[PDB]
């Protein structure tokens, strides 16, 4: 004996259908960058080695139907095998979360590159003296970059005077002019 | 038996003009150019020597080196397809005749191609991909007489050094085998030999 196979949501047929909306929205939160659901809530529904495939099979479905901009009728036709409440649940999740999923995909298209800026921070400080000169009073900016490369996040730091920061901003303003012709 | 065929229909029109430039050559000039081109192809990394030969050839005839480069490029198009396909000399000859090289000159080029082709075929097979090619092996056969844990031991061992080409660079791989492992290793690699000597 073995379960059915077909639309990869065949593993959802094991759920009690009243749990449907909770799990599917929480998987979408994980797609978009929040926490995924925890197995402890569903350990009676799937095996621990099976649960890992439930998450993957659901995430692929939502990504695929949004990326292809499918019509609602073509989505219904893919859901024909599911329980009617699971069919209705999934259609509602699409309508409510379509625009949020689409933004997650756009973020993932930027990752088709060798390195990405993950986060930044900055500090302004005043240097009051040094071993070279006692009446130094030089403003400096420290810019901290977190760059994701080869699946690891690397910290960089860059220090700028008033004039270096002016050249930086003047260059990024030229880039922004081009961005705003496209955006 | 044999059948005449061209390499392919997409060919630059300039190639036909270059064959007309070979028609302008004297037979002694054409034959010298044939041998110069094959002298490169028999040593195909000696590009500097070929360029020196082209300079001498250009200076001897007093022909523009740019026009000579055209002739060289136009000629090379036929062997590249021919060697990849493994075309016959007569097929190469008919193609050169279609390009407009005179049938005698195309005959000499196809015959010198014919002689060189077994040499060039062996070269081409060498270029084909290999994954982590073994290029050298060194070995040491010995006995462990004593250790820090036991005064007396008496354990036979084999050490191998494998030198492995990994694209642009080489690596050394060090492996120690016990006595039972050595015979198991040698027994397997003799099976390899046997199946490399028979198929189907």
């Amino acid at each position: 004996m073995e379960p059915e196979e077909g639309t990869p949501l065949w593993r959802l047929q094991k759920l009690p259908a009243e749990l449907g909306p909770q799990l599917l929205h929480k998987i979408i939160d994980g797609i978009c960058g929040r926490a995924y659901p925890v197995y402890q809530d569903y350990h009676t529904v799937w095996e621990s080695e099976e649960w890992m495939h439930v998450l993957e099979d659901i995430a692929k479905f939502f990504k695929a139907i949004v990326g292809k901009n499918l019509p609602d009728e073509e989505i219904f036709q893919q859901l024909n095998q599911l329980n009617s409440l699971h069919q209705e649940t999934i259609m509602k999740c699409v309508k409510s979360r379509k625009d949020e999923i689409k933004q997650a995909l756009s973020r993932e298209i930027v990752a088709i590159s060798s390195a990405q800026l993950q986060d930044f921070d900055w500090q302004v400080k005043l240097a009051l003296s040094s071993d070279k000169i006692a009446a130094l009073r030089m403003p400096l900016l420290s810019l901290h970059l977190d760059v994701k490369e080869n699946g690891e996040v690397k910290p960089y730091s860059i220090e700028m005077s008033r004039e270096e920061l002016q050249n930086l901003i003047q260059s990024l303003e030229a880039a922004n002019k081009v961005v705003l012709q496209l955006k | 038996m044999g059948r005449l065929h061209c390499t392919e229909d997409p060919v630059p029109e300039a190639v036909g003009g270059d064959m007309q430039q070979l028609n302008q050559l004297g037979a002694q000039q054409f034959s010298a150019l044939t041998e110069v081109l094959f002298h490169f192809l028999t040593e195909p990394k000696e590009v500097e020597r070929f360029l020196a030969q082209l300079s001498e050839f250009a200076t001897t005839n007093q022909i523009s080196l740019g026009s000579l480069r055209s002739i060289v490029k136009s000629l090379l198009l036929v062997p590249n397809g021919a060697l990849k396909k493994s075309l016959t000399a007569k097929q190469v000859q008919a193609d050169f005749i279609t390009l407009g090289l005179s049938e005698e000159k195309a005959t000499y080029f196809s015959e010198k191609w014919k002689q060189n082709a077994p040499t060039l075929a062996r070269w081409a097979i060498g270029q084909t991909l290999m994954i982590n090619q073994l290029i050298d092996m060194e070995w040491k056969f010995g006995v462990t007489s004593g250790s820090s844990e036991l005064e007396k031991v008496g354990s036979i061992f084999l050490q191998l050094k494998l030198v492995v080409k990994k694209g642009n660079q080489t690596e050394n791989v060090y492996i120690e085998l016990t006595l039972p492992q050595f015979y198991s290793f040698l027994h397997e690699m003799e099976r390899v030999r046997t199946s490399m000597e028979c198929f189907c």
Binding site: I109, I112, V178 | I131
Partner: protein, 70 residues
């Protein structure tokens, strides 16, 4: 040897750079995800020009032809 886990692509235009106001050239960018020995998975990305894609795509059509008549 290595095995492909996934293949992804994007098509884009390079529009402008600080040295060249009108770049305006298209590219194809490919991401390969490969599994190593013991299943360690890693990604590699590279750009192609549009002529390079046409060649890359053309050669895979040769592989598919020989692999049937092998």
């Amino acid at each position: 040897t290595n095995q492909l886990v996934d293949f992804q692509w994007k098509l884009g235009m390079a529009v402008s750079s600080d040295t060249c106001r009108s770049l305006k050239y298209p590219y194809v960018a490919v991401m390969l995800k490969v599994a190593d020995h013991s299943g360690q998975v890693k990604t590699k990305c590279f750009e192609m020009t549009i002529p390079q894609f046409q060649n890359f795509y053309r050669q895979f059509k040769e592989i598919a032809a020989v692999i049937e008549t092998v």
